[model samples]
Target chain A: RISPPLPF
Target chain B: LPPGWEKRMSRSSGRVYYFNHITNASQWERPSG
Candidate 1:
Protein backbone atom coordinates (compact mmCIF):
# COMPACT_ATOMS: atom_id res chain seq x y z
CA ARG A 1 0.00 0.00 0.00
CA ILE A 2 1.13 3.64 -0.60
CA SER A 3 2.20 5.78 2.43
CA PRO A 4 0.03 8.66 3.66
CA PRO A 5 1.23 12.31 3.51
CA LEU A 6 2.95 13.89 6.61
CA PRO A 7 0.50 15.70 9.06
CA PHE A 8 2.92 18.69 9.60
CA LEU B 1 63.83 60.12 32.61
CA PRO B 2 63.00 62.39 35.61
CA PRO B 3 60.46 64.23 33.46
CA GLY B 4 58.55 60.96 32.75
CA TRP B 5 58.54 60.03 36.48
CA GLU B 6 57.32 63.53 37.48
CA LYS B 7 54.51 63.44 34.88
CA ARG B 8 52.96 60.30 36.49
CA MET B 9 53.14 61.84 40.01
CA SER B 10 51.03 64.93 39.14
CA ARG B 11 48.24 62.79 37.58
CA SER B 12 46.89 61.18 40.80
CA SER B 13 45.08 62.91 43.68
CA GLY B 14 41.47 62.83 45.03
CA ARG B 15 39.73 64.06 48.25
CA VAL B 16 36.07 64.15 49.43
CA TYR B 17 34.39 65.64 52.57
CA TYR B 18 30.79 64.67 53.46
CA PHE B 19 28.79 67.34 55.41
CA ASN B 20 25.59 65.31 55.90
CA HIS B 21 27.24 63.01 58.45
CA ILE B 22 23.91 63.30 60.45
CA THR B 23 21.64 60.68 58.82
CA ASN B 24 24.61 58.36 59.19
CA ALA B 25 24.73 59.31 62.95
CA SER B 26 22.33 58.64 65.86
CA GLN B 27 19.18 60.66 66.90
CA TRP B 28 20.43 61.38 70.48
CA GLU B 29 23.60 63.04 68.95
CA ARG B 30 21.78 64.88 66.13
CA PRO B 31 21.08 68.08 68.12
CA SER B 32 24.78 69.05 68.43
CA GLY B 33 27.92 68.41 66.26
Candidate 2:
Protein backbone atom coordinates (compact mmCIF):
# COMPACT_ATOMS: atom_id res chain seq x y z
CA ARG A 1 0.00 0.00 0.00
CA ILE A 2 2.99 2.24 0.50
CA SER A 3 4.68 1.47 -2.81
CA PRO A 4 4.35 2.64 -6.41
CA PRO A 5 1.22 0.74 -7.52
CA LEU A 6 -0.83 1.92 -4.59
CA PRO A 7 -3.81 -0.17 -3.55
CA PHE A 8 -6.18 2.57 -4.59
CA LEU B 1 -9.74 8.66 -7.00
CA PRO B 2 -9.55 10.67 -10.20
CA PRO B 3 -10.63 14.01 -11.84
CA GLY B 4 -9.25 16.47 -9.28
CA TRP B 5 -8.95 17.70 -5.77
CA GLU B 6 -11.12 20.78 -6.07
CA LYS B 7 -11.06 19.12 -2.69
CA ARG B 8 -8.06 17.42 -1.11
CA MET B 9 -7.53 13.66 -1.20
CA SER B 10 -3.90 12.45 -1.13
CA ARG B 11 -2.22 13.10 2.22
CA SER B 12 0.65 14.95 0.59
CA SER B 13 -1.74 17.08 -1.40
CA GLY B 14 -3.53 17.94 1.77
CA ARG B 15 -0.32 19.05 3.42
CA VAL B 16 0.94 21.01 0.42
CA TYR B 17 -2.39 22.53 -0.58
CA TYR B 18 -5.67 22.02 1.23
CA PHE B 19 -4.30 21.54 4.75
CA ASN B 20 -7.97 22.05 5.14
CA HIS B 21 -10.06 20.02 2.65
CA ILE B 22 -12.07 19.68 5.68
CA THR B 23 -14.18 17.37 7.40
CA ASN B 24 -15.18 20.79 6.15
CA ALA B 25 -12.97 23.07 3.89
CA SER B 26 -13.61 25.97 6.32
CA GLN B 27 -10.14 26.53 7.78
CA TRP B 28 -9.04 26.65 4.16
CA GLU B 29 -11.82 28.85 2.84
CA ARG B 30 -14.58 30.17 5.02
CA PRO B 31 -17.80 30.09 3.02
CA SER B 32 -19.02 33.56 4.16
CA GLY B 33 -15.73 35.04 5.38
Candidate 3:
Protein backbone atom coordinates (compact mmCIF):
# COMPACT_ATOMS: atom_id res chain seq x y z
CA ARG A 1 0.00 0.00 0.00
CA ILE A 2 1.13 3.50 -0.79
CA SER A 3 0.06 6.75 0.71
CA PRO A 4 -1.02 9.56 -1.60
CA PRO A 5 -0.08 13.08 -0.66
CA LEU A 6 -0.90 16.49 -2.11
CA PRO A 7 2.05 18.55 -3.28
CA PHE A 8 1.89 22.25 -2.73
CA LEU B 1 11.12 61.42 6.67
CA PRO B 2 7.91 60.10 5.08
CA PRO B 3 7.38 56.63 3.56
CA GLY B 4 4.33 54.82 2.34
CA TRP B 5 3.42 51.39 0.89
CA GLU B 6 0.64 53.52 -0.65
CA LYS B 7 4.10 54.81 -2.74
CA ARG B 8 11.84 56.66 -1.32
CA MET B 9 10.47 53.32 -0.05
CA SER B 10 7.72 53.58 -2.62
CA ARG B 11 12.45 55.06 -6.15
CA SER B 12 14.92 54.59 -3.31
CA SER B 13 11.65 52.85 -4.01
CA GLY B 14 11.99 49.06 -4.16
CA ARG B 15 9.88 46.22 -2.91
CA VAL B 16 10.07 42.46 -2.82
CA TYR B 17 7.31 40.05 -1.88
CA TYR B 18 7.65 36.29 -1.94
CA PHE B 19 5.86 33.18 -0.74
CA ASN B 20 7.18 29.63 -0.60
CA HIS B 21 5.88 26.32 0.60
CA ILE B 22 6.91 22.96 1.99
CA THR B 23 3.31 21.71 2.20
CA ASN B 24 -0.32 22.82 2.38
CA ALA B 25 0.21 26.29 0.97
CA SER B 26 2.76 27.29 3.57
CA GLN B 27 4.21 30.77 3.31
CA TRP B 28 7.70 32.04 4.00
CA GLU B 29 9.85 35.07 3.41
CA ARG B 30 13.57 35.30 2.49
CA PRO B 31 14.07 31.57 2.59
CA SER B 32 17.51 30.03 2.21
CA GLY B 33 17.85 26.30 2.11
Best by lDDT: 2
DockQ for candidate 1: 0.00
**Which stretch of 10 consecutive residues in model 1 chain B shows the poorest summed lDDT?**
B2-11
Q: Where does candidate 2 stray beyond 4 Å?
A: A1-8, B1-27
Models ranked on lDDT: 2, 3, 1
Model 1 regions lying over 4 Å from their true place = B1-33
All candidates' chain B TM-scores are: 0.14, 0.15, 0.16
Per-residue alpha-carbon lDDT of candidate 2 for residues B1-33, written as tens digits (9 for 90 to 100): 222324333443342232233242322332223
Which residue pairs does candidate 3 place in steric collision? B7-B10
On DockQ, who's better, 1 or 2?
A: 2
Best by DockQ: 2
* CAPRI-style quality class for the chain A–B interface of candidate 1: incorrect
Sort by DockQ, best first. Answer: 2, 3, 1
| Two-chain DockQ for each candidate model | 0.00, 0.04, 0.02
> Of models 1 and 2, which has the larger lDDT?
2
- DockQ of the two-chain complex in candidate 3: 0.02
Residue B20 local lDDT, model 1: 30
